[PDB]
Design an enzyme around this catalytic site. Structure first.
Site, short mmCIF file in Angstrom:
data_model
loop_
_atom_site.label_atom_id
_atom_site.label_comp_id
_atom_site.label_asym_id
_atom_site.label_seq_id
_atom_site.Cartn_x
_atom_site.Cartn_y
_atom_site.Cartn_z
N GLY A 1 40.97 34.72 47.60
CA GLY A 1 42.28 34.18 47.87
C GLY A 1 42.74 34.95 49.06
O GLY A 1 43.95 35.41 48.96
N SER B 1 42.53 38.55 48.39
CA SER B 1 42.12 38.67 46.90
C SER B 1 40.45 38.38 46.72
O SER B 1 39.78 37.71 47.64
CB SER B 1 42.79 37.93 45.82
OG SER B 1 44.48 38.43 46.02
N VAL C 1 37.50 38.28 43.16
CA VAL C 1 37.01 38.37 41.81
C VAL C 1 35.62 38.74 41.55
O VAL C 1 34.96 37.73 41.85
CB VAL C 1 37.67 37.36 40.82
CG1 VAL C 1 37.17 37.44 39.16
CG2 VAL C 1 39.14 37.30 40.77
N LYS D 1 39.62 42.14 39.66
CA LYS D 1 40.11 41.49 40.69
C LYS D 1 40.45 42.53 41.67
O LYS D 1 40.96 43.77 41.16
CB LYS D 1 41.47 40.68 40.48
CG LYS D 1 42.16 40.05 41.40
CD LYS D 1 43.51 39.32 40.88
CE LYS D 1 44.17 38.62 41.90
NZ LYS D 1 45.43 38.00 41.58
N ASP E 1 53.35 26.00 40.13
CA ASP E 1 52.20 25.55 40.79
C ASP E 1 50.90 25.65 39.86
O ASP E 1 49.76 25.89 40.27
CB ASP E 1 51.97 26.85 41.99
CG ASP E 1 50.82 26.28 43.23
OD1 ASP E 1 50.82 25.18 43.43
OD2 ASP E 1 49.80 26.87 43.17
C1 LIG Z 1 30.76 34.72 33.73
C2 LIG Z 1 31.41 33.46 34.22
O1 LIG Z 1 32.59 33.71 35.05
C3 LIG Z 1 33.25 32.42 35.51
C4 LIG Z 1 32.79 31.47 36.08
C5 LIG Z 1 33.62 30.55 36.84
C6 LIG Z 1 33.07 29.49 37.31
N1 LIG Z 1 31.80 28.78 36.87
N2 LIG Z 1 31.63 27.62 37.47
C7 LIG Z 1 32.19 27.91 38.63
N3 LIG Z 1 33.18 28.85 38.51
C8 LIG Z 1 34.08 29.34 39.45
C9 LIG Z 1 34.73 30.54 36.32
C10 LIG Z 1 35.45 31.71 35.89
C11 LIG Z 1 34.70 32.61 35.22
N4 LIG Z 1 35.44 33.92 34.87
C12 LIG Z 1 36.40 34.46 35.07
N5 LIG Z 1 36.68 35.62 34.27
C13 LIG Z 1 37.69 36.12 34.57
C14 LIG Z 1 38.74 35.82 35.70
C15 LIG Z 1 40.02 36.49 36.09
C16 LIG Z 1 40.33 35.82 37.19
C17 LIG Z 1 41.92 36.79 37.48
N6 LIG Z 1 40.19 35.07 37.82
C18 LIG Z 1 39.05 34.48 37.51
N7 LIG Z 1 38.61 33.29 38.50
C19 LIG Z 1 39.17 32.70 39.51
C20 LIG Z 1 39.13 31.38 39.73
C21 LIG Z 1 39.67 30.62 38.89
C22 LIG Z 1 39.70 31.07 41.29
C23 LIG Z 1 37.59 30.64 40.05
C24 LIG Z 1 38.00 34.98 36.56
N8 LIG Z 1 36.91 33.94 36.18
#
Ligand SMILES: CCOc1cc(-c2nncn2C)ccc1Nc1ncc2cc(C)nc(NCC(C)(C)C)c2n1
Length: 257
Positions: free
Chosen positions: A19, A22, A24, A38, A132
């Site tokens: 971001g 930012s 993650v 993060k 948003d």
């Molecule tokens: C182990 C699997 O982890 C994830 C895979 C995928 C995913 N699967 N396919 C595509 N994507 C991106 C998406 C999410 C997660 N878990 C996660 N946990 C905790 C998270 C905390 C924060 C503050 N922001 C995330 N994400 C940012 C985004 C929304 C901008 C992506 C976070 N994301």
């Protein structure tokens, strides 16, 4: 490949998103337990952007106790150069899950809707209006939807489709009713497979359609019933005539079945 937060050591496995400043990451502690970190870079950040990250971290801490539908924050480290946030790890975000999944189960959709309402209602009680809201703001954690951010700080990427009409016309605002419209658009997508104004590609023409009162939003017939009434009540152009969140929590769709 490795980073330190407070006293605990974490090993990086892979990056999830970015971001601007930012980032993650998917991590593991000494006891091999999964967490999400993060990282915010503050080297290029100004006085206005610095205070916005300070404000969102404060609210994330305070609201931990108030609801279980808000992402868990375990620890954080704040210096003049960076921010480290040790949070729980989710399975997938709602947007990435929606794009992959073809057909959605009505019991799953009803469950997700109640989770979103509980989470957005909590921030409203503390005088926060997201303004948003989109599927990417929601995380799937063991068959439960949790709210990721409060819209105070800057957004992240792994659209004007979720924008309320009152925001466009204001060119002294706004009200919690703005988040109700955005939430309605997420539900409309989980019901029909497209947002109410996805059909319009020209952004100037799309923005005019949202504010136009004569423009009729399509509501095709479906077996559910109370679901179609929620959609019509959420997608009202007049915010004063639009349904409130305490009203939505008492609606037959959320309470009956
Ligand atoms: C182990 C699997 O982890 C994830 C895979 C995928 C995913 N699967 N396919 C595509 N994507 C991106 C998406 C999410 C997660 N878990 C996660 N946990 C905790 C998270 C905390 C924060 C503050 N922001 C995330 N994400 C940012 C985004 C929304 C901008 C992506 C976070 N994301």
């Amino acid at each position: 490949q490795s980073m330190s937060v407070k006293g605990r050591i974490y090993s990086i496995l892979k990056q999830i998103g970015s971001g601007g400043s930012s980032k993650v990451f998917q991590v593991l502690n000494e006891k091999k337990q999964i967490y999400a970190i993060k990282y915010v870079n503050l080297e290029e950040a100004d006085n206005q952007t610095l205070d916005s990250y300070r404000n969102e971290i404060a609210y994330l801490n305070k609201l931990q106790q108030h609801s279980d539908k808000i992402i868990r924050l375990y620890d954080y480290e704040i210096t003049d150069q960076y921010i480290y946030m040790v949070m729980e790890c989710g399975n997938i975000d709602l947007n990435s899950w929606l794009k992959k999944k073809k057909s959605i189960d009505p019991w799953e959709r009803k469950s997700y809707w109640k989770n979103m309402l509980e989470a957005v209602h909590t921030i409203h009680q503390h005088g926060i209006v997201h303004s948003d809201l989109k599927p990417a703001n929601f995380l799937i954690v063991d068959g439960m939807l949790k709210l990721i951010d409060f819209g105070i700080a800057n957004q992240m990427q792994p659209t004007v489709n979720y924008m309320p009409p009152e925001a466009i016309k204001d060119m002294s605002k706004i009200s919690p009713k703005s988040d109700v419209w955005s939430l309605g658009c997420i539900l409309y997508y989980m019901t029909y497979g497209k947002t109410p104004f996805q059909q319009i590609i020209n952004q100037i023409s799309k923005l005019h359609a949202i504010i136009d009162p004569n423009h009729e939003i399509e509501f095709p017939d479906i077996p559910e019933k109370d679901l179609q009434d929620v959609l019509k009540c959420c997608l009202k152009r007049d915010p004063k005539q639009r349904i409130s969140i305490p009203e939505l929590l008492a609606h037959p769709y959320v309470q009956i079945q």
